Amino acid sequence: GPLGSLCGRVFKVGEPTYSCRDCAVDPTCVLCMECFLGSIHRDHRYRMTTSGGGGFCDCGDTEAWKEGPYCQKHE
């Protein structure tokens, strides 16, 4: 997987991405669905944006999230 990423996911065409409006630096900070659903951000105000192809999951990037950087799979 991409060097420097804990999750490793690169988004498929049509695959949902999740940015937490309450915690993300900006809308480019995203989680894949499995990371999002196992994260504290599932209860926050969020944005589901479908990837057009490409981009990558930011799970475990402690600079991307004001709180809750690791989902349960990546704890």
26 labeled binding residue: no
Q: Which of residues 12-71 bind Zn ion (CB under 5 A)?
A: 20, 22-23, 32, 35, 41, 44, 57, 59, 71
User: For residue 25, what are the CA distances in angstroms to 13, 59, 73?
Assistant: 24, 13, 22
Q: Which residues bind to Zn ion, rule: CB under 5 A?
A: 7, 9, 20, 22-23, 32, 35, 41, 44, 57, 59, 71, 74
From the annotation, which residues make up the binding site? 7, 20, 23, 32, 35, 41, 44, 56-59, 61, 71, 74
